[PDB]
Design an enzyme around this catalytic site. Structure first.
Site, PDB file in Angstrom:
ATOM      1  N   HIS A 135       9.529  27.111  44.620  1.00  0.00           N
ATOM      2  CA  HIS A 135       8.961  25.916  43.962  1.00  0.00           C
ATOM      3  C   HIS A 135       9.363  25.734  42.501  1.00  0.00           C
ATOM      4  O   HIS A 135       9.194  24.644  41.937  1.00  0.00           O
ATOM      5  CB  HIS A 135       7.434  25.909  44.093  1.00  0.00           C
ATOM      6  CG  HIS A 135       6.928  25.807  45.501  1.00  0.00           C
ATOM      7  ND1 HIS A 135       7.345  24.774  46.344  1.00  0.00           N
ATOM      8  CD2 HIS A 135       6.015  26.568  46.155  1.00  0.00           C
ATOM      9  CE1 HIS A 135       6.710  24.970  47.494  1.00  0.00           C
ATOM     10  NE2 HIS A 135       5.879  26.024  47.424  1.00  0.00           N
ATOM     11  N   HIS A 172       5.386  25.754  53.014  1.00  0.00           N
ATOM     12  CA  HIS A 172       5.561  24.705  52.000  1.00  0.00           C
ATOM     13  C   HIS A 172       7.010  24.283  51.896  1.00  0.00           C
ATOM     14  O   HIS A 172       7.938  25.089  52.049  1.00  0.00           O
ATOM     15  CB  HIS A 172       5.055  25.167  50.599  1.00  0.00           C
ATOM     16  CG  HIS A 172       3.623  25.629  50.610  1.00  0.00           C
ATOM     17  ND1 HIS A 172       3.309  26.965  50.707  1.00  0.00           N
ATOM     18  CD2 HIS A 172       2.468  24.912  50.559  1.00  0.00           C
ATOM     19  CE1 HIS A 172       1.985  27.053  50.690  1.00  0.00           C
ATOM     20  NE2 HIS A 172       1.419  25.834  50.614  1.00  0.00           N
ATOM     21  N   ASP A 258       3.443  32.595  54.761  1.00  0.00           N
ATOM     22  CA  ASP A 258       2.253  31.726  54.774  1.00  0.00           C
ATOM     23  C   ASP A 258       2.284  30.785  55.984  1.00  0.00           C
ATOM     24  O   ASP A 258       1.328  30.040  56.203  1.00  0.00           O
ATOM     25  CB  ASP A 258       2.010  30.984  53.454  1.00  0.00           C
ATOM     26  CG  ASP A 258       3.239  30.319  52.829  1.00  0.00           C
ATOM     27  OD1 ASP A 258       4.257  30.202  53.531  1.00  0.00           O
ATOM     28  OD2 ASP A 258       3.139  29.839  51.655  1.00  0.00           O
TER      29      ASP A 258
END
Ligand SMILES: CCCC[C@H](NC(=O)[C@H](C)c1c(C)[nH]c2ccc(O)cc12)c1ncc(-c2cc3ccccc3nc2OC)[nH]1
Ligand SMILES: [Ca+2]
Ligand SMILES: [Ca+2]
Ligand SMILES: [Zn+2]
Length: 367
Positions: A135, A172, A258
């Site tokens: 990110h 994500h 995740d």
């Protein structure tokens, strides 16, 4: 055949602390290491301690001002940097913590060192479980990431590889990596992620790249509850088509955990075997491969996942019964390596999975 594996780890990584209640726990990297040591996977790999990446190495991507701020900010001087904290997005999801910069140096050092080892043709696979912080942006921290070790490792691979394929199985969207290479055809970014009312809010299947990079960014948006079956109906066909069309000479695989069932922040339902099937799929193409970590917030499951994925990299079968280890009590009540999916509904119907796969295949025909 079986492949040579180099593994990067610093014994101090587990001591970095994001703060009380913060879901990012570097200790999970030490749990992974101790579990894989206790399974005897050290006798099969070349283990290396990464160097502390310098601010200069980091500015091959990040802005000088942002790296200077990261190297300067401390919990004791935070009050003097109120302006810069807002500018660089440090202080919420990305807190200021003791040794923040050193943590970035070690996470980045492992990824860059792994890329150098692959460039030198001294290994088939390089593993850095402390990396994969996808990110981070050019001049901003984001989503618990400060320095984008992946972008830096890809820039290193680009010194000897014409085309690099990046695959991201974190729940994500791999936004920082996609953004860095959005207008180039020298890197193809492929991200499978939850999309809709979820961080970072990007990764629509209509985001396909721009300019020379058009058709070189691939996004597979998913809904809550994806399982091993659904992920397995789409991952190998998409990666096979990407390999066929793009013909990369090196691959970087972000293995964010995740996306597993029971993750504290995630909403997927994969098992460790389902997640590791991705590593198996990529590994079969026999290309220089850099395997990185990423998210993962139910730390007993992150340790199970990355230990099993290290065993997969080594083509080493390991028992389901966990060996005794320094964190044995964290693996109760079962003390097994493999996990069971939950009863959560899979909102990704088989028709939805086939339809998105078909739309991405249309884009891949454009290469
Ligand atoms: C992997 C990173 C995920 C980040 C993510 N951030 C966000 O969701 C925020 C609101 C956000 C932002 C800033 N931009 C967005 C864009 C789209 C979107 O849907 C959401 C966001 C997060 N999910 C858990 C937390 C979280 C952060 C904490 C920080 C300190 C202490 C406790 C915390 N607990 C948390 O969840 C126990 N944060
Ligand atoms: Ca992803
Ligand atoms: Ca691209
Ligand atoms: Zn994640």
């Amino acid at each position: 055949g079986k492949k040579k594996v180099c593994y990067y780890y610093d014994g101090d990584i587990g001591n970095y602390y994001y703060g009380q209640g913060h879901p990012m726990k570097p200790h999970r990297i030490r749990m992974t290491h101790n579990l894989l040591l206790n399974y005897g996977l050290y006798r099969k790999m070349e283990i290396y301690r990464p160097h502390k990446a310098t601010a200069e190495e980091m500015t091959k991507y990040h802005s000088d001002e942002y790296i200077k701020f990261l190297r300067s900010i401390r919990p004791d001087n935070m009050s003097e940097y109120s302006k810069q904290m807002q500018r660089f997005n440090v202080g919420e999801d990305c807190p200021v913590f003791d040794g923040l910069f050193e943590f970035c140096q070690l996470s980045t050092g492992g990824s860059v060192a792994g890329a150098v080892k692959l460039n030198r043709q001294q290994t088939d696979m390089a593993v850095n479980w402390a990396g994969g912080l996808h990110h981070a942006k050019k001049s901003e921290a984001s989503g618990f990431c400060y320095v984008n070790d992946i972008v830096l490792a890809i820039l290193e691979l680009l010194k000897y590889h014409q085309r690099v394929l990046y695959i991201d199985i974190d729940i994500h969207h791999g936004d920082g990596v996609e953004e860095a290479f959005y207008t180039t055809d020298r890197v193809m970014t492929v991200s499978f992620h939850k999309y809709g009312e979820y961080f970072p809010g990007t990764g629509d299947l209509r985001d396909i790249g721009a300019g020379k990079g058009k058709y070189y960014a691939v996004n597979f948006p998913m809904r809550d509850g994806i399982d091993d079956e659904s992920y397995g109906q789409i991952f190998k066909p998409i990666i096979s088509k990407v390999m066929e069309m793009y013909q990369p000479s090196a691959v970087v695989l972000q293995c964010g955990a995740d996306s597993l069932s029971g993750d504290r922040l995630g909403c997927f339902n994969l098992t460790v075997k389902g997640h590791a099937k991705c590593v198996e799929v990529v590994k079969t193409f026999n290309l220089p491969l850099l395997m990185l970590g990423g998210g993962g917030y139910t730390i007993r499951n992150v340790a199970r996942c990355w230990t099993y994925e290290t065993a997969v990299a080594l083509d080493c079968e390991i028992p389901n019964e966990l060996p005794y280890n320094d964190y044995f009590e964290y693996f109760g009540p079962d003390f097994k390596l493999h996990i069971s999916p939950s009863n959560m509904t899979n909102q990704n119907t088989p028709e939805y999975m086939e339809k998105i796969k078909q739309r991405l295949f249309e884009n891949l025909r454009m290469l």
